[PDB]
Design a binder for this molecule. Structure first.
Ligand SMILES: [Zn+2]
Ligand SMILES: [Zn+2]
Lengths: 285, 780, 134
């Protein structure tokens, strides 16, 4: 359907490409700073009974990328029946270990029709060494640090499916606050800062029972095909426990996900996002 | 007298039903291979040894249709023997002669070769036009290279029977004790003397005894062999297991955690796999001949298809997954499937490879199971938030707080229990002959698997356990008789420190010529899944997966020790090859190998291995290798992450190509970062002996030109900003001009019309990989 | 608690030739894609913190009244005795060097260095107030 694409245009490096739960954490910290704690209680109720966001995905000059569905691994041989058998093998494993697809090839994978992978990835994970100096006797003691560096026009976007009144009051003021603070990572070195633009993107998805998630979900029942993403977090200097999420591109059958509340012994409850973002998919046989 | 049971007779009878071939190959008895092998075993009963060899001669005497179409001569032969001496019934011993006879056909296509070739050798499984000489399987004194000599003189065949005569005399008559005897001596012996036979005799007997044991466990009798319902009914069952998440299991650990510790996470992954393989074999009642291969977390077992076996396999898979989830939280997972097959499913029928069709059905069930990673848990997505959960600093385990012991090295750090067990293993590895598999609640259990616990069998200690896993040898020594000898191989080369242990990342970053950097190589064998799908019979899969495993388990350690240099010739080197290289082999599976060490010897080992891999095969299989050069005090999950991103960069392009050094390139799509193997050795024979003399020293009259060779890479970066000869063609002629040396690199000054006509890059673009390696070696 | 963000934008001019270095034998830090150099946010924040900690090390007696957390510090480093925070200004040891980092929220709230640049601490933290972009 029609989604709102929040385009995040980088001012520097990112620590990571932010998952859906560290965007909802960053949005939730932005609302209590701007409005207060009573507006976070309404932000959560608008996503429980309503709107849903996704993980962050890369783009490269108006070429939006989307995760590869997990439906195309069982039936990969069935997709490539019309191909020369001397090169079906190298085409298969190159297509299988790919991570992202653009909008032309993401639509063709939901209907189990043939497709191609991108040739270039719009970012690189870079190992930058830093140093720690003694103030008096300047002894160098290095450590190693990871960053995501983007190309000249590339960046990060995420999707939003919900009512316009909630987007105009909660998500749109949060992304102007989060442009000046960070979006996860060493934000004191200028990492995570970005300029925000708003667009509209359309995905042509088939109608079925089975659907792929474009976000981490924390499923309420057993999924159909999935990839376990095991992450925790950190909330105001308190360590969050590692929860078993589902990855982007995993396949559920009528599963909303569910928003987990962790006591965490903090002034206020900590909600971890965990909700689906379904687009219909055709499974193999 | 001796009480002998029926499955000991079928598993051993199929294991030596073709002992008359090597004996028949020699001229000692001058008779039919069954006639010679019957008299070879009856003469072995007469000599000091067991009484059962008179009973086991029957399998070698009557194992063809021309020998078994009597049905009256068979019975009166058993009456001259006595199964009552061994507790066997008349009906029990007659069944096993038909089980072994029928399994000898499912082992390989039943094609009659009429007169056997006087002495044709074993042709190579990789390149079937070439052939192997007969040699001892020892992993010293020779690399098996398929050559051009196509006939075996009948002298070493007579020396084969002599050396096999006393090895069978000393070993006790059980299944686990005859398999290492027959593997050392009958590996490079062809089974059927013909042209283009690529089945080894050991793997043909190992798979007859596998199928015959799996037929008796299922319960097919003698009249089910004469009639059908053994080849028309699903009786067998291919088990296949696979470990998912190995590179995330070994190579996750932090800046804490030594190489000594990182090397023992690989020894512990090998023991988790053997704990699941040996548990299936014990509960289903099978022997180790059933295990088709076990290489790098991927095993295959030929077993029976009974409702009692499916009930056991469903519980072994269950109990192994609830152990792995509790111990390693969703970082390592074992996927076990089983596809029921039949006798027609082995071999070829109707011009179709029905065995590879039955394996693509099985490989598809592994792929679906890997997309459901812990579905058999029932609490996998349910959450429990008991407080005080702390985290290990070495690996990323999340424990309950309080279960973190103080470590051995630094008592200020608090680590998990299984990183205290694996640092004591890392000090005990240089004096370690193997592991004893015993109960988990036992004294001295140092590491535990999902089913059994393992005690380290030290260099000068006594072994304890119901079955011992002996490392890198096919000789059982100083173990008890009933200790169930399981031999396993591992690539275990490591540079030793002034102590006896494993050298650190400091001592490998030292002793490298030039700069001090750590070299990390990672590679695999390309299109290897296609090559295993060419196999018709399961005896061809037995040969193809075992010669493939011995290059990386057994013959990669001799490549490091400077052996086999006549076949390898001259490779790109920076120094003369030492007697004890500072090279640490971390992991080396069927088609994978991760090796760390000094960067100038990681570089030379990359070409020494590929040039020897080319000789081991017939040129039909190749190697992609990614190379890396790192700071020492870099976390090992990050060294492994970069070279894994370089090994697949060198794989999607042309797949027979090495990734030597980092490279800046243009974005025009005609420029690939990674050299072909024949390309980079040609640039080394061309460009390197002009400017470089070895051992960190430049060539004579090119001393004090250290600044000269960085200019040629500054000229080379003008090509990267903009190709099509903006400025670089005459600036090369200017800097070669003002120094008086123009024999240095004549291909760089004038534009190559041969390069423009094929849209390939200029010869100034490919000289980055030859200069930048020499600039690091002559840094200081 | 939040009120706004004072943003300072300016041009940094290299009057003499600049080196930062990443490890031509000593290459400066560059972008991985375009190949251009820059100045990291870590180098500029870490130099401004280092220059200002030596400024505060010289004025611990005169700034006790304005910044009450500087009464707990004597000028010097804890390097002559391999011991954590006890009296000296350069109290925190990271790996091999000694840095002023306040150990709590309530102490870093009244330090001139750590209310601005931040503090790690144990059982509590103090995040920075400045962001030094690349
Ligand atoms: Zn640990
Ligand atoms: Zn302070």
């Amino acid at each position: 359907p029609k989604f709102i694409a929040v385009k995040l245009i980088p001012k520097g490096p990112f620590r990571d490409i932010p998952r859906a739960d560290t965007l909802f954490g960053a949005i939730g910290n932005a609302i209590s700073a701007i409005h207060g704690q009573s507006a976070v209680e309404e932000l959560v109720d608008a996503f429980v009974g309503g709107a849903r966001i996704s993980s962050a995905f890369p783009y490269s000059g108006d070429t939006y990328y989307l995760p590869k569905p997990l439906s195309v691994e069982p039936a990969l041989e069935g997709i490539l029946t019309g191909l020369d058998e001397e090169e079906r093998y190298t085409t298969a494993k190159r297509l299988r270990k790919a991570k992202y697809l653009d909008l032309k090839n993401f639509e063709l994978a939901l209907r189990l029709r043939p497709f191609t992978i991108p040739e270039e990835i719009p970012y690189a994970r870079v190992d930058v060494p830093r140093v720690v100096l003694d103030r008096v006797t300047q002894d160098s003691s290095i450590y190693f640090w990871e960053e995501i560096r983007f190309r000249e026009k590339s960046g990060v976007y995420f999707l939003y499916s919900g009512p316009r009144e909630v987007f105009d009051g909660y998500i749109a003021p949060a992304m102007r606050f989060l442009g000046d603070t960070g979006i996860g990572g060493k934000s004191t070195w200028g990492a995570g800062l970005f300029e925000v633009e708003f667009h509209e993107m359309k995905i042509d998805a088939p109608g079925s029972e089975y659907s792929v998630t474009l976000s981490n979900a924390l499923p309420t029942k057993t999924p159909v095909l999935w990839r376990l993403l095991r992450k925790g977090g950190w909330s105001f200097g308190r360590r969050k426990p590692r929860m078993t999420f589902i990855a982007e591109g995993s396949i559920v059958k009528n599963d909303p996900g569910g928003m987990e509340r962790l006591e965490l012994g903090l002034s206020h409850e900590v909600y971890v996002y965990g909700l689906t973002f379904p687009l219909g998919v055709e499974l193999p046989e | 007298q001796d009480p002998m049971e029926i499955d000991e007779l079928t598993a051993l009878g199929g294991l030596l039903h073709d002992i008359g071939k090597p004996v028949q190959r020699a001229g000692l008895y001058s008779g039919d291979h069954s006639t010679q092998g019957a008299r070879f075993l009856r003469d072995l009963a007469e000599n000091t040894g067991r009484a059962e060899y008179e009973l086991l001669s029957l399998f070698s005497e009557f194992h063809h249709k021309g020998h078994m179409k009597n049905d009256e001569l068979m019975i009166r032969r058993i009456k001259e023997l006595s199964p009552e001496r061994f507790g066997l019934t008349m009906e029990d011993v007659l069944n096993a002669l038909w089980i072994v006879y029928e399994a000898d056909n499912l082992a390989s296509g039943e094609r009659e070769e009429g007169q056997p070739q006087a002495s044709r050798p074993l042709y190579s499984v990789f390149n079937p036009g070439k052939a192997y000489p007969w040699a001892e399987l020892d992993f010293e004194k020779e690399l098996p290279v398929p050559g051009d000599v196509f006939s075996i003189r009948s002298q070493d065949y007579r020396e084969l029977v002599k050396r096999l005569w006393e090895e069978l005399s000393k070993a006790k008559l059980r299944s686990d004790r005859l398999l290492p005897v027959l593997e050392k001596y009958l590996t490079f012996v062809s089974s059927v003397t013909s042209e283009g036979n690529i089945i080894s005799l050991y793997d043909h007997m190992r798979m007859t005894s596998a199928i015959a044991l799996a037929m008796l466990r299922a319960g097919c009798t003698a009249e089910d062999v004469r009639s059908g319902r053994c080849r028309k009914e699903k009786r067998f069952l291919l088990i296949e297991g696979d470990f998912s998440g190995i590179q995330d299991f070994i190579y996750r650990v932090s800046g804490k955690g030594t190489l000594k510790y990182l090397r023992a996470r690989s020894a512990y992954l090998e023991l988790i796999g053997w704990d699941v393989v040996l548990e299936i074999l014990s509960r289903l009642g099978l022997t180790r001949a059933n295990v088709v291969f076990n290489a790098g977390g991927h095993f295959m077992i030929i077993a029976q298809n009974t409702p009692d076996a499916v009930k056991e396999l469903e519980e072994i898979r269950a109990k192994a997954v609830e152990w792995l989830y509790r111990e390693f939280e969703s970082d390592l997972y074992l996927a076990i499937e089983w596809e029921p097959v039949s006798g027609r499913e082995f071999g070829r029928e109707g011009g179709k490879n029905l065995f590879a069709e039955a394996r693509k059905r099985l490989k598809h069930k592994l792929t679906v199971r890997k997309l459901k990673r812990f579905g058999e848990i029932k609490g996998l997505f349910e959450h429990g938030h008991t407080e005080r959960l702390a985290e290990c600093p070495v690996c990323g385990r999340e424990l309950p707080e309080g279960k973190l012991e103080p470590s051995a090295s630094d008592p200020e750090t608090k680590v998990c229990p299984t990183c205290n067990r694996l640092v004591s293993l890392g000090g005990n590895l240089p004096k370690l002959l193997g592991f004893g598999r015993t109960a988990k609640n036992d004294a001295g259990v140092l590491v535990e698997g999902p089913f059994s616990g393992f005690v380290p069998y030290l260099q000068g200690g006594r072994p304890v356990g119901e079955q011992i896993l002996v490392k890198n040898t096919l000789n059982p020594g100083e173990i008890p008789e009933s200790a169930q000898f399981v031999p396993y191989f591992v690539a275990d080369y490591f540079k030793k420190d002034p102590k006896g242990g494993v050298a650190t990342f400091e001592e490998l970053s030292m002793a490298s010529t030039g700069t001090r950097r750590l070299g990390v190589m990672k590679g695999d064998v390309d299109r290897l899944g296609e090559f295993f799908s060419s196999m018709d019979s399961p005896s061809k899969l037995a040969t193809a997966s075992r010669f493939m495993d011995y290059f990386f388990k057994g013959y990669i350690g001799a490549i490091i020790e400077g052996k086999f240099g006549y076949i390898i010739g001259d490779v790109p080197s920076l120094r003369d090859w030492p007697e004890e290289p500072d090279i640490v082999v971390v992991y080396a599976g069927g088609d994978d190998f991760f090796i760390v060490g000094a960067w100038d010897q990681i570089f030379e080992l990359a070409f020494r291995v590929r040039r020897a891999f080319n000789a081991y095969t017939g040129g039909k299989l190749t190697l992609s290798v990614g190379l890396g050069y790192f700071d020492e005090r870099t976390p090992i999950y990050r060294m492994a992450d970069v070279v894994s991103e370089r090994l697949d960069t060198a794989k999607d392009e042309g797949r027979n190509r090495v990734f030597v050094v980092g490279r800046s390139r243009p974005l025009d799509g005609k420029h690939k970062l990674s050299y072909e193997w024949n390309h980079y050795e040609e640039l080394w024979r061309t460009y390197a002996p002009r400017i470089y003399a070895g051992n960190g020293r430049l060539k004579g009259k090119l001393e004090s030109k250290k600044g000269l060779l960085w200019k040629l890479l500054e000229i080379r970066e003008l090509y990267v900003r903009d190709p099509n000869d903006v400025r670089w063609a005459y600036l090369t002629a200017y800097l070669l001009g003002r120094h008086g040396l123009s024999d240095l690199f004549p291909e760089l000054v004038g534009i190559d019309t041969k390069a423009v006509e094929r849209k390939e890059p200029q010869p100034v673009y490919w000289v980055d990989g030859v200069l930048k390696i020499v600039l690091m070696a002559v840094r200081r | 608690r939040f009120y706004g963000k004072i943003v300072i934008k300016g041009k940094i001019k290299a009057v003499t030739g600049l080196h930062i270095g990443s490890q031509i034998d000593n290459p400066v830090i560059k972008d991985p894609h375009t190949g251009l150099p820059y100045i990291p946010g870590s180098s500029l924040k870490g130099r401004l913190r280092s220059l200002f900690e030596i400024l505060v090390n010289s004025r611990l007696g005169e700034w006790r009244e304005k910044y009450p957390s500087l009464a707990n510090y004597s000028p010097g480093s804890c390097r002559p005795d391999n011991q954590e925070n006890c009296g000296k200004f350069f109290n925190r040891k990271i790996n091999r060097g000694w840095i002023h980092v306040c150990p709590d929220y309530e102490t870093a709230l009244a330090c001139p260095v750590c209310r601005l640049f931040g503090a790690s601490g144990k059982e509590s933290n103090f995040p920075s107030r400045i962001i030094v972009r690349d």
